[PDB]
Amino acid sequence: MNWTGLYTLLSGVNRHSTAIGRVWLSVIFIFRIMVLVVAAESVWGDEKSSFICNTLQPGCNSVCYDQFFPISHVRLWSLQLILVSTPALLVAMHVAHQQHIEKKMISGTLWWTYVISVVFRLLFEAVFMYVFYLLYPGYAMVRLVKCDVYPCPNTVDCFVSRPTEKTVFTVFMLAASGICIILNVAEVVYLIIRAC
Amino acid sequence: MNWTGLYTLLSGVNRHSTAIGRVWLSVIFIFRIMVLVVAAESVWGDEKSSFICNTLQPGCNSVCYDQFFPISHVRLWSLQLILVSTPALLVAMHVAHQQHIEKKMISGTLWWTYVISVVFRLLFEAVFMYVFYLLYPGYAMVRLVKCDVYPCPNTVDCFVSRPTEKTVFTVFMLAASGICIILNVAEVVYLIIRAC
Ligand SMILES: CC(C)CCC[C@@H](C)[C@H]1CC[C@H]2[C@@H]3CC=C4C[C@@H](O)CC[C@]4(C)[C@H]3CC[C@]12C
């Protein structure tokens, strides 16, 4: 777990990444993973089991939970991290492949593919930010929700588990994601400026 | 409870009633009352409380019982006895009123009103027989019924209490009612024949 080994691993052995991309982006990425790990099973572990509705209708609990939580926040963030990390993984594999072929026997190609990688990383961050806004308007969760989907008769009151703690972690993850967007834009601008 | 007192009470102090109307009709009427008394609270006492359906839907028990038993057999027979007994009560009151006014101070009127009374008694018997057939086709009740009325989901199985015992008493009451119809027709025919 040598510091130089961890730095080499996270940097992806890329010769075009700048200081921000090799230090700040990696740290914020680690921060999001650690927050997600400590908050996934602990806070969102009983999201559905503890979800109850004030009714005697069989199946109203499950249908109301599905109505109000089409996809859990933890899974949404997990997908966001995987999708955001994919272009970095592709660049690392491409660099390793180039090292392999040159050992068996370019700089502009590496520069261009890195820039495209950062652009796609920024694009994925923006898309997931918009999707999160679309599914869950606002940032705070409420204790009581009004559910009227079939088979629930009329409108029933359903209660969410730990809405305040989930709100706190939602703010943390959203703030970290916003910082990643800002750093990605700065990285793109810095690369373009240095290219001239 | 002197026998002559009971006979005078049941006959209605009528001078036109024949032997069948004063003996057989009264006995069958007493028979129906006694059968109804012993079978009302004992057999049909738990008709709704013991009625259960194989479902978790709240309210499906009550709605299914109402669907399959719009009116209980005991109440239907109770109404039949009251309605059948009404023309006899009217004739008895009219006879008493005539006695009252003559004491204060006709035979054809008494004869005609008695004949009309028997005709209406026969008519009420026939109507209730038809209504019983209309609400409960056949004579035997079944242990299991298929109920699909709202709010019950799809079709549910509901179970009736004491369907065999209720079937036995249904046959008894129906047979007694049929005998009353036959005796009433015989009474009308005999009166018409004797009138000539
Ligand atoms: C600058 C930032 C974005 C760098 C992010 C680096 C991420 C994308 C890289 C760094 C090291 C990578 C890991 C290296 C090895 C493995 C083992 C493999 O069997 C599963 C994937 C897994 C666990 C990789 C997941 C992606 C990973 C964590």
Ligand SMILES: CC(C)CCC[C@@H](C)[C@H]1CC[C@H]2[C@@H]3CC=C4C[C@@H](O)CC[C@]4(C)[C@H]3CC[C@]12C
């Ligand atoms: C030949 C057949 C049909 C005769 C039938 C006689 C029936 C209709 C008559 C005979 C005596 C009557 C009862 C005489 C007195 C009373 C008391 C009153 O406060 C309520 C009704 C009640 C209880 C009457 C109900 C009707 C009754 C039972």
